[PDB]
From a paper:
The eukaryotic guided entry of tail-anchored proteins (GET) pathway mediates the biogenesis of tail-anchored (TA) membrane proteins at the endoplasmic reticulum. In the cytosol, the Get3 chaperone captures the TA protein substrate and delivers it to the Get1/Get2 membrane protein complex (GET insertase), which then inserts the substrate via a membrane-embedded hydrophilic groove. Within the membrane targeting stages of the GET pathway, the homodimeric ATPase Get3 (also called TRC40 in metazoans) adopts closed and open conformations in response to nucleotide load and interactions with other pathway components, allowing binding and release of the TA protein respectively. However, the cryo-EM structures and native mass spectrometry of hsGet1/Get2 and scGet1/Get2 show they form a 2:2 heterotetramer, which is stabilised by Get3 and interfacial lipid binding and is important for efficient TA protein insertion.
We subsequently obtained single-particle cryo-EM reconstructions of both amphipol- and nanodisc-reconstituted ctGet2ΔN-Get1/Get3 at an overall resolution of 5.0 Å and 4.6 Å respectively. In both reconstructions, there is clear density in the membrane region for two three-helix bundles at a local resolution of 6.5 Å. Weak density also shows that helix α3’ is present in the same conformation relative to ctGet2 TMD3 in both the amphipol and nanodisc reconstruction. Furthermore, the density map for the nanodisc-reconstituted sample provides evidence that ctGet2 TMD1 and TMD2 occupy the same position in the heterodimer as the equivalent hsGet2 TMDs, albeit they are poorly resolved and likely exhibit flexibility on the edge of the complex. Interestingly, the conserved fold of the ctGet1/Get2 heterodimer adopts a different position in the membrane compared to the structure of hsGet1/Get2, with each heterodimer half exhibiting a 40° rotation with respect to the membrane plane. This is largely due to ctGet1 TMD1/TMD2 not adopting the parallel arrangement observed for hsGet1, instead being tilted by 40° relative to each other. As a result of the rearrangement of ctGet1/Get2, the hydrophilic groove of ctGet1/Get2 is tilted so that it is open towards the cytosolic leaflet of the membrane, in contrast to the hsGet1/Get2 hydrophilic groove opening to the cytosol. In addition, ctGet2 TMD3 no longer completely traverses the ER membrane, which is notable given the high number of charged residues found at the N-terminal portion of this helix and the adjoining cytoplasmic loop. Indeed, we observe significant thinning of the nanodisc in the vicinity of ctGet2 TMD3. As this helix encloses one side of the hydrophilic groove, such membrane distortion would likely lower the energetic barrier for substrate insertion.
Author numbering:
A (entry chain A), D (entry chain B): 14 to 105, 120 to 185, 205 to 339
B (entry chain D), C (entry chain C): 300 to 313, 335 to 357, 1001 to 1181
């Protein structure tokens, strides 16, 4: 297929973008490259991170906190790396016993109020990045968890309880509309990343069929660190490493060449930071570099 | 056994109001007969509030009273372990906050030590839930019958003892012989009344006052 | 309700043989009374084999007969889908052999196509198990009562009809009046017998022959 | 701790050795290196493989089948790469419906009769290699599966059924004695392998706590492809690759230096085959190569 992300630019009715996978892949570099190349043709784009690695500070050498702002060099870069434990600081005895009754409560309510603040403004599009997957995909379960929790709190009742009852009802209707906005597929998309070895491909296919069991498609898949040989210069270990990399590369060619896209992105010698260097790294997601192979 | 799945498969093929009004009239004449005229009427008076609580029963909320009954005794072993349960739960949530606050990159050893303590306490958590919820539902099943003996023992003793001993005498000539038949069966002398309608239908006497309370709050 | 957990907590605090011998003697005189002396005795004769099958009941094995009952009719929809179920199961195990025979290295695309067909059919497998096992246990619950009506309707009709009509006359003077009392209650004329001991205690007559079969096979 | 496998040599009362992990690590090279260095001080050692990759043929360029034999260059090398599907060929209609009743039947019975043939001879020690783990660890579940299956077969009964009943009882008592020999820990040991990246370490720790939930310890952990710099010569990509490899290496140093062993094994330029080359590769499991680091 087309080895670029031109189809994400072309729709323009998209609103929500999910991008993930597993660690050891540098998803933050992919995220910032997506956002910057998105900003060339967009109006109001917001980045959101929840990984405990405070990596956007490393991305721009500028401290961020619990409020959005514009960072230098851009008129549209807004982001706020947040913590879920601040809501637990909001919990700091009966509500903690409720957290014993259901092992997950506060993270969904925090994500809820976050998304209310998200829909407070009039931003054009947003993007995401997440933790390992077993800790991610629970957000499709947050509406049900919220319902069960509210029912249980009411079960114990059988300070004012009606205030938290109405608050949880507002969280219920809000999360139902947002998950309902998820399956629309005209504003919600999903891209996953991986790297040429076994296990990365393994959990990648597990993720794909996972989203297949929820009725959300995809069409674009990015890989990373695809080493291509330098003309003339050679490392002898790098030769066999290229050989094995081609071996899995052609296997992914045997799978996804029908209805998905493959993004070739080579590793550079440095961890690419700085604005202009990230621009050059982001440029390749439109113009695919191709040596004679 | 359920007579409901049998009814779920049955789909595959193709006086009492005037009775309660006459029990109202006999309760009127029984209430009038006390002013111009003893202890057994107060026995029925307490059984009326017993049947009332049977009506305004919270079969859980009785055990909600039993909760503060056992939130009271300091020499209780179980409420002691209940406090130890909440203490372990507090240390549980504490390390869970320190877990989710940590990063999986640069404290991976500290990551694992936290994870190990996490599933360490996670198993002992529901062991107490298995212990105490078993004790609580068994204690409820004991005291349900423990109250039920004091209820129905007085619901049948009154008819056992003090039956031949007449409680009060019916006016001579008001009721036909066949109506009087009721008196003949419990051994009470002909012309006197037994103690039945006070057991069952006297529950209706306060039942309208129950709906009076239904107008009080609502 | 169980009277067993109540007995599990009760630990926390601190003529019939001579009756069966006289029913044996009355069965001896009832068996002697037929040779020197009609249709109702054959009705009891069939109810004896009904109670026998009640004894030698396989409550599943009756439905094992119902299995070949519905392994018989070719116009059955369910046995048709049962054959389609086994056909899909055969294709299932076929691809599973081709899966485990394959390698996860050099047919990784073929690996995934096999894996996708694997969990493709794996979900539709137990859908039929939910369908047919529901139909089978509901059909069993229908026919248990469907037989039980033919059993106990004859267990009570015999006492309803042909009660005043005397079945046979007791010899004059053998039994005291109080023994004769039994006859008075079902409307049969005094000096004749009713149809009860043939219902319940005649099950003992064949019961020893049941243990005769217990000596035959074992 | 001691960076070798000297403790496995020193006990001599050991009988069974389990070695595993995940793909992409070359466990067969580790297995043959273990067996050959084991044979220097042993009497009767048997290798057993069940992975569908017929790799011992690649290990020695000699075809093997369903019977043990001695291979050239050795007096003690015996192995037979077997298939579980031969037992399904033994099944080739009611027994297949029994396989529908329980999704796993024939693999445990095949492994059972294999182990009867194992205990037929008088061999000193054996070794193993397995598929991915979710398909492995079911062997600790085979005794229970066997019991449930036998009970169910008898449930349907309520050709001769008593013959398969007695056969399954013999399989029951045999598998109970073998699993009972497992927890003895004086003849059954376990080593796992991994490589310096994230996910390999991740599932490695998952395996360790998995065996912790069955009461079987370990003390030795091997890694692979640990690139050490050549003096003078350098590849610039290899420098940063060494840096990241050290980063995870020191993290494993922060975990296992208390009561486990670390085996440093460097990658060579070729897939090491041939007997003498495998001897040189196997030598390092006793004498650990150490550059100045
Ligand atoms: Zn190099």
């Amino acid at each position: 297929m087309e080895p670029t992300l031109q189809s994400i630019l072309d729709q323009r009715s998209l609103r929500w973008i999910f991008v993930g996978g597993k660690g050891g892949v540098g998803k933050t570099t992919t995220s910032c490259s997506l956002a910057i190349q998105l900003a060339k043709v967009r109006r109001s784009v917001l980045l959101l991170s929840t990984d405990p690695a405070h990596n956007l500070s490393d991305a721009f050498s500028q401290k961020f906190g619990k409020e959005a702002r514009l960072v230098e060099g851009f008129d549209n870069l807004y982001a706020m790396e947040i913590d879920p434990n601040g809501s637990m600081q909001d919990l700091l005895g009966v509500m903690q016993d409720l957290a014993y009754a259901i092992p997950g409560i506060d993270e969904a309510m925090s994500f809820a109020e976050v998304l209310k603040q998200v829909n407070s403004l009039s931003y054009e599009t947003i993007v995401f990045d997440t933790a390992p997957t077993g800790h991610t995909l629970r957000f499709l379960q947050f509406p049900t968890v919220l319902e069960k929790a509210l029912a249980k709190v009411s079960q114990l009742s059988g300070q004012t309880l009606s205030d938290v009852m109405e608050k949880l009802d507002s969280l219920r209707v809000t999360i139902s509309e947002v998950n309902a906005q998820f399956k629309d597929e005209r504003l919600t998309t999903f891209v996953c990343v991986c790297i040429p070895e076994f296990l990365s491909l393994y959990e990648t296919e597990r993720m794909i069929q996972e989203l297949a069991n929820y009725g959300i498609d995809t069409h674009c898949i990015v890989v990373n660190q695809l080493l291509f040989p330098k003309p003339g210069s050679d490392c002898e270990q790098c030769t066999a490493r290229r050989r094995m990399q081609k071996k899995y590369l052609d296997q992914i060619e045997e799978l996804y060449d029908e209805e998905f896209n493959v993004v070739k992105m080579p590793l550079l010698v440095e961890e690419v930071r700085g604005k202009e260097r990230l621009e050059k790294f982001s440029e390749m997601l439109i113009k695919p570099f191709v040596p004679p192979e | 056994v359920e007579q409901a799945i049998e009814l779920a498969l049955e789909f595959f093929p193709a006086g009492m109001t005037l009775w309660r009004d006459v029990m109202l009239a006999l309760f009127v004449l029984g209430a009038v007969a006390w002013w111009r005229a003893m202890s057994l009427l107060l026995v029925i008076f307490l059984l009326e509030l017993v049947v009332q609580l049977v009506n305004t029963i919270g079969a859980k909320t009785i055990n909600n009273l039993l909760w503060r009954f056992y939130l009271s005794i300091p020499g209780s072993p179980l409420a002691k372990d209940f406090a130890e349960q909440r203490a372990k739960q507090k240390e549980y949530l504490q390390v869970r906050h320190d877990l989710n606050a940590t990063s999986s990159q640069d404290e991976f050893a500290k990551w694992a030590r936290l994870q190990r303590k996490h599933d360490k306490l996670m198993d002992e958590l529901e062991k107490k839930k298995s212990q105490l919820d078993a004790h609580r539902t068994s204690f409820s099943r004991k005291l349900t019958i423990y109250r039920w003996i004091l209820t129905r023992g007085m619901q049948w003793f009154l008819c056992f003892w003090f039956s031949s001993q007449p409680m009060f005498w019916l006016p001579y000539g008001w009721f036909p012989y066949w109506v009087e038949w009721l008196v003949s069966f419990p051994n009470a002398p002909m012309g006197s009344v037994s103690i039945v309608v006070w057991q069952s239908a006297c529950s209706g006497v306060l039942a309208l006052v129950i709906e009076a309370v239904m107008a009080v709050v609502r």
